[PDB]
Amino acid sequence: HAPVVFTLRTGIAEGRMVYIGVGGDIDRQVNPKLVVHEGETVQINLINGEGAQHDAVIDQYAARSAIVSGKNASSTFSFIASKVGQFDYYCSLPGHRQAGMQGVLQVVPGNRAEMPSTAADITRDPADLPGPIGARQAKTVRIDLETVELKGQLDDKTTYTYWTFNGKVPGPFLRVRVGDTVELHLKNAKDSLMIHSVDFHGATGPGGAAAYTQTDPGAETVVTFKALVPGIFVYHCATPSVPNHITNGMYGLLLVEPEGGLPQVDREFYVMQGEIYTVKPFGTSGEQEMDYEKLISEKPEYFLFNGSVGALTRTHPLYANVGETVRIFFGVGGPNFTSSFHVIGEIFDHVYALGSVTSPPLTGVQTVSVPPGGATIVDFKLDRGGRYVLVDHALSRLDHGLVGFLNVDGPKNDAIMHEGPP
Amino acid sequence: HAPVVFTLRTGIAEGRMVYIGVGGDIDRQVNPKLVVHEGETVQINLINGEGAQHDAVIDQYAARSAIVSGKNASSTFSFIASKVGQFDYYCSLPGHRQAGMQGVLQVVPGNRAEMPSTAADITRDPADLPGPIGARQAKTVRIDLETVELKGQLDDKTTYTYWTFNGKVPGPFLRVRVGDTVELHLKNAKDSLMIHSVDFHGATGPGGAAAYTQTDPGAETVVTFKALVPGIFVYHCATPSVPNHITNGMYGLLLVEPEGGLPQVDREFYVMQGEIYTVKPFGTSGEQEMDYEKLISEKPEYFLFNGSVGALTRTHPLYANVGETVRIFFGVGGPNFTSSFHVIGEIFDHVYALGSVTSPPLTGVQTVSVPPGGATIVDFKLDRGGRYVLVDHALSRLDHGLVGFLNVDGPKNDAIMHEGPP
Ligand SMILES: [Cu+2]
Ligand SMILES: [Cu+2]
Ligand SMILES: [Cu+2]
Ligand SMILES: [Cu+2]
Ligand SMILES: [Cu+2]
Ligand SMILES: [Cu+2]
DSSP: OOOEEEEEEEEEETTEEEEEEESGGGTTOBSOOEEEETTOEEEEEEEOSSSSOBOOEEGGGTEEOOOBOSTTOEEEEEEEOOSOEEEEEEOOSTTTTTTTOEEEEEEESSOOOOOOOSSBOOBOOTTOSOOOOOSOOOOEEEEEEEEEEEEEEEETTEEEEEEEETTBBSOOOEEEETTOEEEEEEEEOTTOSSOBOOEETTOOSGGGGGGGOOBOTTOEEEEEEEOOSOEEEEEEOOSSSHHHHHHHTOEEEEEEEOTTOSOOOSEEEEEEEEEEOBSSOTTOOEEOOBOHHHHHHTOOSEEEETTSTTTBTTTSOEEEETTOEEEEEEEEEESSOOEEEEEETOOEEEEOGGGOSSSOOEEEESEEEEOTTEEEEEEEEOOSOEEEEEEESSGGGGGGTOOEEEEEEOOSOOSSSOSSOO | OOOEEEEEEEEEETTEEEEEEESGGGTTOBSOOEEEETTOEEEEEEEOSSSSOBOOEEGGGTEEOOOBOSTTOEEEEEEEOOSOEEEEEEOOSTTTTTTTOEEEEEEESSOOOOOOOSSBOOBOOTTOSOOOOOSOOOOEEEEEEEEEEEEEEEETTEEEEEEEETTBBSOOOEEEETTOEEEEEEEEOTTOSSOBOOEETTOOSGGGGGGGOOBOTTOEEEEEEEOOSOEEEEEEOOSSSHHHHHHHTOEEEEEEEOTTOSOOOSEEEEEEEEEEOBSSOTTOOEEOOBOHHHHHHTOOSEEEETTSTTTBTTTSOEEEETTOEEEEEEEEEESSOOEEEEEETOOEEEEOGGGOSSSOOEEEESEEEEOTTEEEEEEEEOOSOEEEEEEESSGGGGGGTOOEEEEEEOOSOOSSSOSSOO
C-alpha cells in the first residue's frame, strides 16, 4: 500500500478534448491506459490544462475527482484496485465524454514484477552497521573509506551519477568509543573525475579532517584524530561544491559511543535522508542529470532515504520482531532540508535531542526536527505487529520518493489495536 | 445585398468550450448575439482557435459551415436572413453544444438604421466633377487647391485623420484642354501640422509642380504650367513621406482634354481607389491610427473607393438611367496596390489603356489593371437596369471595404437577362 500514482492534465490533442498523461510511463500520451495490479492503491491527480470544467469518474469503483474549473485547478482521488478488468475513466461534465474525455484503467491479476535494474544498487541496507562495541578501553582504530563515482538506480527505470563513500548511500556507519584515536585512510578511486574529502562532525580541527583529506583521483590521504566527544555525528565530503558532493550521496554517520555504551536494545538501524536536484521532474525515466539552479535555490525533485526511491520499501526495507526494542540512528545528509522524522504507528520512547548522547533523552515524542548536518537517535518497543512507515512529516515529500517500511510480523487484531469495539 | 459579416473563433472562456467574437460589435464576447435585419445577407466566418473539431449550424436556415479541424482552419458560409426571430448557432460535433458551443442569431424586422456619424464626411461624391469643356481655344485657367488635415468617417463607428485637397478624397476633379496654361494656387490650411505640395502627372518640370508647391501651414504657393499632353492624370501630394501623404488621402485626377474633347457620353463619374494602413484590423470601432510598419511593408487594413467604407454604397453611390452611355474616370492614388477594376454585370465598351486619351481604346474588356499613380477611362451603355457593382477583382479586398454601387432603375426581367428559359 505505497500508492501507484498517475497525473492527468485536461486539454486539446488529436482534434478532441482529452486527458493527457504527465510523467511516468504515460508522459504526453492522450487518454493513456492506466495499468494497475489487483489490490494496488491507485492515486489519480487531475490538473485542469485549458480552463473548462472537468472531473474524472470510474463507475465500478464509485471513485471520482472533484470538478476542477480554472487552469491549474487540481483534484486527487484514490481507491484500491480490488476488481480485475478494464474500467473507463471519463469526464461527467455535459458532453465532455462525447467530446473525447475518456480512457481505460486496466486492473491486471497478480503482483507487479520488479523492473530489471540498469545501474548498481547504491542503497545502504539499514541493517548494514557495526553493533555495540564491547565494554573496553580507548584504543587506536583504523578506518578505510574509498570515494567512488558511479551510476546508480535512483528509481526503477531512472539512473543518476552518485558520488559515494564505498559505493553506497549513506556511506559506512563508523562506530568508535569516546577517547579512541581514529587513523582514517581516504582512497579516491582512479576513475573519479573529482577531488574528494571527508569532514566528520565528531572530529576537532581544520575542516573536521577535510583540510587533511582533499584526495586527488587514484591517490590516498591519511589523517589521525581523537574522538574527544560522544555523539551521533554526520560525516560528509567537504570538496567544493560541498552541496554538490552531498546531494550526489557523500554523507554518513559516526557514532562516538559514551563510556557506558548506549542503552541495551534488541535491534539497530542506519537511516539517512537527502535530496537530489534533477533537470527533469520526479518520475521521469532514463539518465537524470543535476540541475545547478535547482540545487542553489533549494528546489529538489527527489527526497530519499538511503540513496534511492524504494530504498527502504522495495530493495532494502527494515525487518524486526514484536517485543523487540529498536534503535534508529537517523541523520540528514541534506544538503538543505530539515526532516520532521516520524514512524507512522509508533511513538518514540526516547529521542536524543540534537543528537546529544550525554543529555537525558526526551520521552513519548511523535516527531523530531533533524537539521541537515544533524543526526538523532530514537528507540521504541515493538508492542505489536504491522508495517511501520518512516516519513518526513513534511508529507508532500512522499510524492518525491521519501518513504520507508519497518516490517514486523504479528496478528492484524490484538488488545493494543483491532477492528471492532472492545 | 452587401453582406453583414461576423467572425467567430472557437476556444475556452467562462469555463466552457465556446464561440468568441472577432472584430466589429462582438470583439472578445463569448457566444455573441448576431443582430441582423430581415432580408440582409449574413456571412459567418468560423476560425478554429484551440484545435478540436468544430462547425456552426443554424437549423431554420439549413445553413452550416464545414467541419474545421486544426488551429486556424476556417469555413465561411452565408444565407439571407429572410425569417425574423431568434435562431441558435451551435456546433454539431459530439457533445460540443452541451459543452457550451451555442449562441443566438437575432433577425429583427425593418431596415438597419445608419450609425449617426462622429466625424466629417470626407467621401467625394462620384458625380462631383466638371462636365465636358465646350469646344474653345487654349487659355489661362486658374485652379485653387487647399490642403486640409481633418478627422473623417472611415467606417460607420470608426474615424481616422485624413490629409486632403479641399477636405474630400479624392481631391477636386481638374478639367482643362491641351494647350491650356494652368495658374495653380495651393493654400495649406493654418491648422495643418504638415507641409503639403502637389505633383500633377500631367505637368512637365521639377516634381510635376511639387518643387514649387512645398507650402508651410497658413501659407500659399502659386505655380504656372502648360498642359502639353492630353491624358487622364493622377495628381498627389509630394511632401515626404509621400506614401504617408497619399494613404491619408492626398490624391485626385486631372483630365487634359484632347482638342476634339472626349467622345460624347450621357453621364460621367469620378472614382479613385486607395489603401489605409491602421494599427487595428478592418472593422475595429473608434479612432484608427496609422501603422508605419504596415505602410512600408504594403500590408493595409482598408481598401477604399473615394475615401471611406460605404463611400459608393451608402453615403454617395452612383445613379444612372437605362439607355445612357456612362464614362468612369478611374484612378489609383494607392499608394501601393494595382486595381483589377471591373463592374459586375457590365462589360467595358471602351478602355483607354494606361490612360492614353490619344491611342485607340481597347473594346469589349471585362477587367483592366490600373497601377498606383495610374488612371484609365472606361465607358459602357446601360442596356438594362440593376445594381452594378464596382470592384477591384483581387476580391479579398471586398473584405477590407472596397465595393461601390451603380444604381440603375429598370425591370428585374427583360430580353437581355431574365429568370426562366426563353
Ligand atoms: Cu471535462
Ligand atoms: Cu566528494
Ligand atoms: Cu558539515
Ligand atoms: Cu465544436
Ligand atoms: Cu500632403
Ligand atoms: Cu506621382
